[PDB]
Paper text:
The overall structure of SsTroA is typical of SBPs in the A-1 family. The peptide chain crosses between the N-terminal and C-terminal domains only once linking the two (β/α)4 domains via a 33-residue kinked rigid α-helical backbone that runs the full length of the molecule and the metal binding site is buried in the interdomain interface. Taken together, the structural and functional data we have presented here clearly demonstrate that SsTroA binds both Zn2+ and Mn2+ with high affinity.
To obtain further insight into the function of SsTroA, we determined the X-ray crystal structure of the Zn2+-bound form of the SsTroA at a resolution of 2.6 Å, and further characterized the recombinant SsTroA. In our structure, we clearly observed the metal binding pocket provided by the buried surface between the N-terminal and C-terminal domains. Independent experimental evidence has demonstrated that the ion bound in the metal binding pocket of recombinant SsTroA is Zn2+ (see metal content analysis). The binding site is buried ∼7 Å below the molecule surface and the four coordinating residues are also completely buried. Accordingly, our structure indicated that Mn2+ is likely to be the natural ligand.
Author numbering: 32 to 309
Write the structure that this text describes.
């Protein structure tokens, strides 16, 4: 009986709950901990999309391998974004868009709005209720932005350099006067160029960076092979991977862990950076 809303990533899974609460029935396609860049829609998945009353996804080719299915049946929460909002890099000609918009709280608040207006119009009777829920979460995102700022303000200008497995924090860095390096491009669907590894090594050396970060969606070996190369130039920069020491880029944490919800996933990321960068 409850409306069925298919949802690509754990990100959206959280958002909708935050907004619609228990009023709708959520169909998460990509399990937390998996990588949407590579996810390939299986029969069951396409089925979920088909059976869905509403389908919500990021867009910007984030899902990477379901554009020709989501664009057909679903609504990208990034439909309202404008050109200047976008981050754009280069890759074999073109002007490739950076999908990791959610670390730009403003952009995420935008997404939240689209999601709200789609759950409203899906539940006419719960529209005001949802709008009320939306406002409360918008404000929580507001408070969050202030939290991150105050939290980051403890990291020295010279230490404002983030190193991650791939380019997924451009929107983040842009929001808080940060510089991001990554041995990989915007998508994770490509071989780790050994020339970008070195590029990164030299960047670490240039800026005397003593901490490179690890993420839950990719193999941390890459960052340990990156650490080894640095030391090969002596060279010595810690790898933040340990246990529970992972940044979330392309996914939240499994319900329910510390990176459970979006705002918590955010705080987790932030605290982690300050600890090894401050
Ligand atoms: Zn990514």
């Amino acid at each position: 009986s409850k409306p069925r809303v298919a949802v690509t990533t754990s990100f959206l899974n959280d958002m909708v709950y935050q907004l619609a609460g228990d009023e709708v029935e959520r169909d998460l396609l990509i399990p937390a901990g998996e990588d949407p860049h590579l996810y390939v829609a299986k029969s069951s998945d396409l089925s979920k999309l088909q059976k869905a009353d509403l389908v919500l996804y990021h867009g910007l080719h984030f899902e990477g391998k379901m554009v020709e299915a989501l664009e057909k049946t679903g609504v990208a929460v990034s439909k309202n974004f404008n050109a200047k909002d976008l981050n754009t890099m280069d890759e074999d000609g073109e002007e490739i868009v950076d999908p990791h918009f959610w670390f730009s709280i403003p952009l995420y608040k935008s997404a939240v709005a689209v999601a709200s207006e789609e759950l409203q119009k899906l539940l006419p009777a719960k529209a005001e209720m949802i709008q009320k829920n939306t406002e409360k979460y918008q404000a929580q995102l507001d408070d969050l932005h202030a939290w991150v700022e105050k939290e980051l303000s403890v990291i020295p200008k010279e230490s404002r350099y983030l190193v991650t497995p791939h380019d997924a924090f451009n929107y983040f860095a842009a929001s808080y006067d940060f510089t991001l390096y990554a041995p990989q491009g915007v998508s994770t669907d490509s071989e780790v160029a050994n020339s970008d590894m070195i590029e990164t090594v030299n960047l670490i050396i240039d800026h005397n960076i003593k901490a490179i970060f690890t993420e839950s969606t990719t193999n941390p070996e890459r960052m340990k092979k990156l650490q080894e190369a640095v030391k090969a130039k002596g060279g010595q920069v810690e790898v933040v991977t340990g246990e529970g020491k992972e940044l979330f880029s392309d996914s939240l944490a499994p319900e329910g862990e510390e990176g459970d919800t979006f705002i918590d996933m955010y705080k987790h990321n932030v605290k982690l950076m300050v600890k090894y960068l401050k």
